[PDB]
C-alpha cells in the first residue's frame, strides 16, 4: 500500500514520459541531472522489487527500460566522455541491477564496459596508497563517492558473472576505503585531497555507499568483520547525522547532497534485512528498527495532498525530485 502510492504519486509529480526522464522539480522546466538520474533508476527498480502489485510491478518494469532509453537519447550509450568517474560509476551500478531484473544484454555490457574503464584506469596505488580518482580528467582527489559505489557494482557483477575478478576487486577497493577514508568506528570521510589530506566531513550517501558494501561483503565472504563494519556505521549516522529529535538531517544547500536520504536508505535497508535474517546484533538490530520506523512516520506525516514528501523531514510550493525521494525510497526498501 504505502511503498506503492508513493512510487505512484512521485512518477506522476516527476516523470516525463515524453523523454523518458524525470523532471528535477515540479516547475517541470529541466530534467533530473545525470548522476542523480542513476539513482531515482534505482528508485524504480527498488519498487519493482518491493511491490506486491502485477500491474504496477509490470508498469515498473517496463519504466526501468524506459529510464536507460532516455537517458542514452540525450546522453549517449558510451559515458566514458564524462570527466565524473563517479557519474559513470553511479550508472555502472544502476546497469548491473538493471540486467540483473531484466536479462537484457546491453545491460551488461554497460555496466562491465564502464566499470572496467574505472576500475581499470583511473585505480592508482602512489597517492595515499589506493583509491580511484574523483575525476578521469584531473587527477587531485579520491572520494568516497567513488570508491564505495565502486565497491558496490563490483559486488553486483560477481553475483552476476561469478568471476573471482570483480569479488576480488571489491574486496581490495572497500580495504583501502575503510583504511583510508573512515576512522575505524563507522565515521566515513568524503575524499582524500593531493597536497592536503583526508577531509573529514560525513554525509548521508557516504555512510551509505560504506554499508551497503560492506553488507555485500559479508555476504559474500562469510567474514563477520564486514557485518560490523556495517554496524558501526549505521550507529554513527544514527547517533551523528540527526538532529537532536533522532530524525536525519536535512543536507541543503548544495543539490547534491539534498537527497543523499534516498541512497542512505536504500542501504540501510540491506543491513535491516541481513540482520533480521541472521538474529546478528539484537540488541542493536531492536534499536535500528525502531529508529528507521520513527523516521519513515515523521517524514510521511509531513506528505502535502499529492502523497509528497519533502527532502526537510523535521519540517514544512515547488517540491524537487531528489530531495522528495528519500521518502518513496524509505517506503521500498529490500
Given amino acids: 500500500s504505502d511503498g506503492d502510492t508513493a512510487m505512484k504519486a512521485f512518477n506522476d509529480t516527476f516523470w516525463d514520459p515524453n523523454a523518458k526522464m524525470f523532471w528535477k522539480d515540479s516547475k517541470r522546466e529541466k530534467h ?33 527500460d524506459d529510464v536507460y532509453d532516455g537517458t542514452v537519447a540525450k546522453y549517449g550509450q558510451d559515458w566514458t566522455n564524462n570527466p565524473f568517474n563517479d557519474d559513470i560509476m553511479w550508472w555502472a551500478m544502476g546497469s548491473a541491477r538493471a540486467y540483473q531484473i531484466t536479462g537484457n544484454p546491453r545491460y551488461l555490457e554497460a555496466a562491465r ?42 559486488l553486483y557483477l560477481y553475483d552476476i558473472t561469478k568471476d573471482e575478478h570483480y569479488l576480488n576487486a571489491a574486496t581490495k577497493i572497500f580495504r583501502w576505503g575503510k583504511t583510508m577514508l573512515t576512522d575505524g568506528n563507522g565515521k566515513v570521510f568524503d575524499r582524500i585531497e593531493i597536497e592536503h589530506g583526508a577531509v573529514p566531513d560525513a554525509t548521508h550517501y557516504n555512510q551509505g555507499t560504506y554499508i551497503g558494501s560492506a553488507v555485500g561483503l559479508y555476504k559474500a565472504t ?48 540491506h543491513l535491516q534485512k541481513t540482520l533480521d535474517e541472521t538474529g546478528q546484533y539484537p540488541e542493536f538490530s531492536a534499536e535500528f528498527d525502531e529508529w528507521l520506523a520513527f523516521n519513515i512516520e515523521m517524514a510521511w506525516s509531513h506528505q502535502n495532498s499529492d502523497h509528497i514528501v519533502d527532502g526537510n523531514w523535521a519540517g514544512q510550493g515547488t517540491y524537487e525530485s531528489w530531495s522528495s525521494a528519500a521518502a518513496v525510497q524509505a517506503l521500498n526498501g529490500i
Fill in 113 to 154: 564496459d564502464h566499470f572496467d574503464f574505472v576500475y581499470d584506469t583511473q585505480w592508482d596505488e602512489e597517492f595515499a596508497n589506493g583509491g580511484i580518482w574523483w575525476l578521469n580528467s584531473d587527477h587531485n582527489t579520491k572520494n568516497a563517492c567513488i570508491n564505495f559505489p565502486a565497491a558496490q557494482a563490483a
Fill in 32 to 64: 533530473q541531472d545525470f548522476w542523480v538520474e542513476a539513482e531515482l533508476w534505482e528508485l524504480v527498480m527498488d519498487a519493482y522489487q518491493h511491490t506486491s502489485d502485477p500491474a504496477l510491478k509490470a508498469e515498473l518494469k517496463t519504466q526501468i
Fill in 222 to 269: 562469510g567474514n563477520a568483520v564486514y557485518l560490523d563494519d556495517a554496524v558501526k556505521a549505521a550507529k554513527f549516522t544514527k547517533n551523528h547525522l540527526v538532529d537532536s529529535n533522532g530524525v536525519l538531517n536535512y543536507e541543503g544547500p548544495n543539490g547534491d547532497l539534498k537527497g543523499g536520504k534516498t541512497i542512505l536508505m536504500r542501504n540501510l535497508a
